[PDB]
Amino acid sequence: GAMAPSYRVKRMDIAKNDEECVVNAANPRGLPGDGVCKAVYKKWPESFKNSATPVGTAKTVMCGTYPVIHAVGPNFSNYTESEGDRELAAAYREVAKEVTRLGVNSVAIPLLSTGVYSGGKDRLTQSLNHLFTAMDSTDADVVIYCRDKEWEKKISEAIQMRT
Ligand SMILES: [Cl-]
Ligand SMILES: [Cl-]
Ligand SMILES: [Cl-]
């Protein structure tokens, strides 16, 4: 584990992360997809061998010795708010189990279901709070990746408020 486990946020492509493993915002079919998923496919294509997994779950595939944890958040265009909220919380709980099993000291993670699976809604607080609920009991250093400048400021504020 990290000596003083922390949360940090960076505004840049998660495919350039400086952590021991990455979480992909995957689709259930293991397809290249769009957004974070497509960047992950371009950087670690070998990790998409048998990466298909249901909504609300995470499945890790190695690219060399580097773990890619494919976490499938719900698409809020298809799910109700209640069911989607439950599956989004579940995907993050599965990421925490995988990070613990892998024994890594750090993990790069995107906010699941905030892009094309958001159903056109701002889900920063919803998704980030489910990330904290799952990851708080782990001792890995967590680095959250985002692309929007206003989202970077809001995620940073939420991290600092709890310290
Ligand atoms: Cl970048
Ligand atoms: Cl998304
Ligand atoms: Cl973003």
Side-chain angles (χ1 to χ4, degrees):
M3 286 299 109
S6 67
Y7 286 107
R8 291 171 56 230
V9 57
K10 294 211 289 182
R11 185 182 79 99
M12 58 181 280
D13 185 353
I14 198 169
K16 298 171 180 188
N17 78 73
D18 189 28
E19 290 68 59
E20 294 181 359
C21 70
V22 69
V23 171
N24 182 23
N27 56 74
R29 304 182 183 268
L31 292 159
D34 303 283
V36 162
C37 193
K38 173 54 65 165
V40 169
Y41 183 72
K42 289 192 185 147
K43 181 61 64 177
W44 301 286
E46 299 90 340
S47 74
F48 286 70
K49 191 178 188 316
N50 293 308
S51 61
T53 195
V55 171
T57 75
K59 184 167 194 189
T60 300
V61 182
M62 297 315 207
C63 172
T65 73
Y66 189 78
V68 176
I69 303 170
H70 295 272
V72 184
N75 179 359
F76 281 94
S77 288
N78 298 333
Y79 282 89
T80 60
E81 290 294 329
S82 190
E83 279 295 280
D85 185 66
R86 185 181 54 73
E87 291 294 6
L88 178 56
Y92 280 118
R93 287 191 303 269
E94 302 296 311
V95 166
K97 292 177 192 175
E98 285 293 280
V99 165
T100 301
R101 185 186 61 79
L102 290 163
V104 294
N105 292 330
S106 62
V107 53
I109 192 167
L111 294 185
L112 301 177
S113 299
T114 64
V116 301
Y117 277 11
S118 67
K121 267 203 179 58
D122 175 341
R123 298 187 187 273
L124 191 171
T125 297
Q126 174 180 27
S127 186
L128 180 61
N129 282 342
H130 285 321
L131 188 161
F132 289 154
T133 297
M135 301 306 292
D136 278 352
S137 63
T138 70
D139 62 3
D141 276 339
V142 171
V143 182
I144 299 167
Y145 283 76
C146 67
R147 303 300 295 270
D148 179 279
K149 291 173 168 184
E150 293 306 303
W151 280 41
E152 178 190 14
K153 282 201 186 77
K154 286 181 276 194
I155 294 164
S156 184
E157 288 167 359
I159 292 167
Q160 298 305 120
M161 286 262 276
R162 352 161 67 206
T163 73

